Design a protein around this nucleic acid. Sequence first.
DNA 1: GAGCCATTATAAATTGTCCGTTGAGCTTCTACCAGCAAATACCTATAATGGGAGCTGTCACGGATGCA
Length: 92
Amino acid sequence: MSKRLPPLNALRVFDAAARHLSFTRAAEELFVTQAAVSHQIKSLEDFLGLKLFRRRNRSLLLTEEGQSYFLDIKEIFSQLTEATRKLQARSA
DNA sequence: GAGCCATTATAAATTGTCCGTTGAGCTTCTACCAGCAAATACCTATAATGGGAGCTGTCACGGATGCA
């Protein structure tokens, strides 16, 4: 069974969506456009089947459907960036 | 009312493709001395001096053939 992992892009914008509280401001930190955020939520939804946020006026709140899947994203990028540091540091 | 999340299109990116090289290691093909097996030559000095070798066991016409 081929292990269909989540896309390499939807995960990082998902962490900055909660911190920045705004989707437009979530794109300036990742030097991308705001339209790229909505492109990747659907592809990752194929595995989840749960909606990631609940709409609020001029605000972004947390829903339990996507909340379970927040807790298994923020540690992936932490260690891989650490991983980049280790080879780079030992190379020097 | 204006900000911000679903839609639509495209090409830049992006990752898995067709083509080649190569040191090395494994599987053939060849040959050639060793060496033993095999093959081939040569010599033997008491004396020895003419077989048939089993016939063939018989039909029996014709047409020549060669003599006398």
